[PDB]
Each structure stands twice: as structure tokens, then as C-alpha cells.
Amino acid sequence: QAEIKIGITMSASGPGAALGQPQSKTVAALPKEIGGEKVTYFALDDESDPTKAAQNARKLLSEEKVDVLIGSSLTPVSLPLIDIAAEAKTPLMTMAAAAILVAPMDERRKWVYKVVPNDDIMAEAIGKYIAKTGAKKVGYIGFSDAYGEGYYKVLAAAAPKLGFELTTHEVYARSDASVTGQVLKIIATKPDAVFIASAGTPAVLPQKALRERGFKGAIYQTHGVATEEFIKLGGKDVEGAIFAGEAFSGAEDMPADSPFRKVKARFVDAYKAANGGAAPTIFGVHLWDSMTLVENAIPAALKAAKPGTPEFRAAIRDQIEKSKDLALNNGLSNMTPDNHNGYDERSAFLIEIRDGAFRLK
Ligand SMILES: O=C(O)C(=O)c1ccccc1
């Protein structure tokens, strides 16, 4: 009989690498037995490319007949996987951020779960903070994709009532070498602050370009930057950046017995043991937390059916939907039939880069 099989596609190369590489390194830390059954992981790089991710998913689903699919790392790469997983009646744990991946619910997103808090929650929280600082004019640059646009649309809708105006809607593609034209346009609007909607190492470019061209005001980013690689590459230019993000990023500033510190230690300890003592970045935890949900669902699913059958996959899908009051590294998660993300505003923590580390603001 087939053991439990988990397929993973992640953006281990391409402009998503700072997200997918940590995920690739987390695979070796994942549990090799659950509910008394062996678990085998099949991990594939999708190169930050939606076409390759779809190919990976179809191979994992049709050839390996995986019980659960996990991925991808990025929103554009993950979007096509929704239909593929639903058609295959296989749960998909996406590791990307945009709300559209699971919300609003529909007959396909019934098959999809999402541990990273929906970007609209984060956008609302950062918008409120920006308003509180007294900023009245806020520049904007973000990725020309559904991740970036999810930030722009929520900020733009909230701006009027918050009491500031978005002075631009500049965009760039993740691999672009330059954003000089966009940054010059932003600077010409003489804003009080600038918002950047980006992720991974590409997020450094617009912030450095703004600083190099004389912008001295506040710069806000997103939880796409919550990797120490961003701090290292960005240096003094990213000092002081603020974003709305996850408990994981603020955990060192929470009480010692906080559940968030406990769930972080479990991940960090396992990751270090599998990776020669190297500390993980947050993006690996999106794989880890996804597997927490899957692991929690498997024992009940095993009472219903054997691994490798549609009935087992359906039981996993049914069970994750019932998960309640669960502290993940990503926040306090409560799944429902209509909410396959599981978070509210209590999941949004304001993070600041201070002295080269992520801190609670
Ligand atoms: O969703 C994405 O495209 C993305 O860049 C991201 C940002 C933060 C956490 C997970 C994915």
C-alpha cells in the first residue's frame, strides 16, 4: 500500500528565490512519519514560473498521486494551481500571500488552504499606521502582478477615509534591473512617505533607488521583505523600514512563554538540525505551518480511508476546514468553510527594521 505522499512546488530559483530556497531547505526538517504512516516528500523547483509550477503540479498529481500538494511561493505562480488541484480533488496548501488565492470562497478554492495571512489584512493594518503618523501624501510602487495590486487596491480604497492620498501608482516587474523612471515620478510628487509592495530581494531596488535619489521620508514595505536577506542586501538604506507582518517576525519581542515563541522554536530547532545549524528565514515557516495543518488532519483522515485514494484526500480537505484556535508562526488560525486563510486583524504585527534586525514597532 502507498505511504502518505506530499508534493511541493516552490520558487527556489528566479526572482522568488529568497522565498523558495528557505522552503526547499525546510523539506528535510518535515516529519517522516505521521499517524503511524510513512510520509514521503516530492519537492520541485518551479523557477518562479507559473507554467513550470503547473507542470510540476500535474506531474505530482498525475504521476506520484500525491495526497496533498503544497505551493507555490508566489502569487502569480500559485494562481493556476487552484484549478489544477480542484480538478484533481487534492488539497492545495499555497505558500503565497494574496487574498485572491482563497477569497472569496468558491467551488475551487474549497480545495485550497493558506497559512500566510491575506494581504488585505496587512494592507489595512499598515494603512492605519501610516495615517497615524500624520502622512498626507504617500507615493506607491509595487509589482505589476496580483501580489502588488492587492496592496494597491486596498490602500487606494482606504486612503480617503484614512486621510491621506496615494500620489502615484507605479509598478515594476520582479526581475527588472531599474526602477529609475518610476522613482523619479514618485519623488516629483513630493510625498511624505512611500509605500513599496514587493517581495524577496527585488524589494531592495526601489528602496535603495529612493534613498539614492534623495528621498528622506518614511518608507513602508510588506511582509514580502521579512527575510534577513533583505536586511543584508539593503543595508543602511532599509534601516527603519516598517511593514505589517507575522508573529514570527516579532517573536523575540513577545513574552518568553508566548505560544508564538514556542511554535517558532519547534520550527527553528528542526530546521537547524536538518541544515547544519543554519538559522531559517520566515519563508521556510510557510512550508512548516502548512505541514502543521496537514499533520493535524492526517490521523482523522486515516480513520476514513487509506493514503493514495481520493477518499483520503477528501478527508484531509474536510478536516483542515475544521481547524480551530491554532497558534501558527503566521498567526492565530481559525478555519471555516468560507475562510480557508483563518486570520483577522489580530494577526497583523507592525514590524520595524532596527539596527539590522526585525523588531516589533
Ligand atoms: O505572494 C507573493 O507573490 C509574495 O511575494 C509573498 C509575500 C509574503 C509571503 C508569501 C508570498
Q: How is 302-327 classified by DSSP, letter by letter?
A: HHH--TTSHHHHHHHHHHHTT--SEE
CA–CA gap between residue 324 and residue 336 (Å, rounded): 8
97 lines ligand 1 (CB under 6 A): yes
The grid cell for 227 is: 527575510
Q: What angle do CA 116, 120, 123 make, to 5 degrees?
A: 105
Do residue 149 and residue 207 come from a single domain?
yes
Do residue 149 and residue 234 come from a single domain?
yes
Task: Tell how far CA 23 is from the center of its chain.
Answer: 11
116 lines ligand 1 (CB under 6 A): yes
CA–CA gap between residue 303 and residue 212 (Å, rounded): 60
Do residue 228 and residue 174 come from a single domain?
yes
Do residue 361 and residue 216 come from a single domain?
yes
CB 291 within 8 A of CB 267: no
How far is ligand 1, taken at its centre, from the CA of residue 165, in Å? Answer: 25
Do residue 149 and residue 26 come from a single domain?
no
**Class of residue 284 by CB neighbours under 10 A (exposed 0-12, middle 13-18, buried 19+):** buried
- Please check if 292 is assigned to a binding site: yes
Do residue 196 and residue 49 come from a single domain?
no
Do residue 316 and residue 226 come from a single domain?
no
Do residue 6 and residue 86 come from a single domain?
yes
Tell me, what amino acid is at 147? Y
Nearest CA to ligand 1 atom 2: 74
DSSP 179: -
Instruction: With CA atoms as reference, report the closest residue to 126 among 161, 97, 168, 155.
Output: 155
Do residue 11 and residue 111 come from a single domain?
yes
Do residue 337 and residue 358 come from a single domain?
no
CA–CA gap between residue 39 and residue 272 (Å, rounded): 21
- Please check if 75 is assigned to a binding site: yes
Do residue 201 and residue 303 come from a single domain?
no
Nearest CA to ligand 1 atom 5: 199
CA–CA gap between residue 94 and residue 359 (Å, rounded): 26
Domain count, the chain: 2
- Please check if 295 is assigned to a binding site: yes
CATH label of the domain that carries residue 1: 3.40.50.2300
CA–CA gap between residue 331 and residue 308 (Å, rounded): 31
For residue 184, give Cα distances in angstroms to 101, 155, 233, 262, 317: 33, 21, 22, 45, 48
Task: Tell how far CA 336 is from the center of its chain.
Answer: 20
CB 341 within 8 A of CB 117: yes
User: For residue 137, what are the β-bridge partners?
Assistant: 165
Sequence-ordered list of residues with C-beta below 8 angstroms from that of 320, at least 6 positions apart, any chain? 91, 113, 293, 294, 296, 297, 335
Boundaries of domain holding 232: 121-255+345-361
For residue 198, give Cα distances in angstroms to 11, 119, 139, 350: 15, 12, 14, 17
Q: What are phi and psi of 169, to 5 degrees?
A: -135, 70
The grid cell for 210 is: 529612493
Resolution (A): 1.2
The grid cell for 136 is: 498626507
Pairing label, strands 92-94, 112-114: parallel
Please tell me whether residue 143 adopts helix, strand or coil conformation: strand
